[PDB]
Point group: C2
Chain length 134, copies 2
């Protein structure tokens, strides 16, 4: 019944999100991303190549946006990405099909985690628009 409660319920139904970085040229870069894990709408985990355009963007500019949607309801968060290389986290969040993209396995240095931490939310849910700092 709470807006954030509906937004959390919406994230739980979404397996993909769209992640945006800002490149050194100043352009925002939205890319579709598999959602590995999320805690509410506060923290969301993804993986990418250490040499990806995403990674190189985030190493210099942490500012980030992320949206998701299902059945005409949508949410866009703003926040920051931390590029995570921790050996224990890489192992913990490893998934089997990751081997396709990261042939070195869970200790592949070409494998990194992206941790997105939200600071704002814009909700387009069930006829209501709310734009709210978190």
């Amino acid at each position: 019944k709470t807006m954030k409660e509906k937004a959390v319920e919406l994230l739980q139904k979404c397996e993909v999100v769209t992640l945006a970085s800002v490149n050194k040229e100043g352009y925002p870069r939205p890319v579709p991303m598999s959602k590995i894990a999320a805690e509410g709408i506060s923290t969301i985990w993804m993986s990418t190549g250490a040499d990806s355009l995403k990674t190189i963007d985030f190493l210099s500019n942490p500012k980030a946006g992320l949206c998701f949607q299902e059945k005409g309801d949508s949410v866009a968060l703003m926040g920051e990405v931390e590029v995570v290389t921790d050996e224990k986290l890489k192992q913990e969040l490893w998934q089997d099909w990751f081997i396709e993209h990261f042939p070195g396995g869970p200790t592949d240095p070409g494998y990194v985690l992206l941790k997105f931490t939200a600071n704002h939310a814009t909700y387009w849910i069930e006829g209501t628009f709310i734009h709210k700092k978190l």
Copy 2:
């Protein structure tokens, strides 16, 4: 054989939704799903929005934009610029019935604005292959 560009045009024709990013005044990129109202190849992509929308506010001060779309493991990510358009002729030509729910004044509604995205650069993920080209 079709080039990455030609493949992307085909992909787009299948998508009725795209994700559009602006950069807000604080430097944060803001991706949002948008209905694709029309497109000319992948070169020009047309969307609609409110005259007072956050997207309109962002683009009025920073034209730099990003747009992506995806169908079935294949994705395309574009970089370019957005112009906010208020041209009466385009407003009426691009009007869709489902706009009534959003712009109660019709194709003449002062609250009704078009977003013209013009692409500069593409990043293709087609056939599990990544290619990053200037347009």
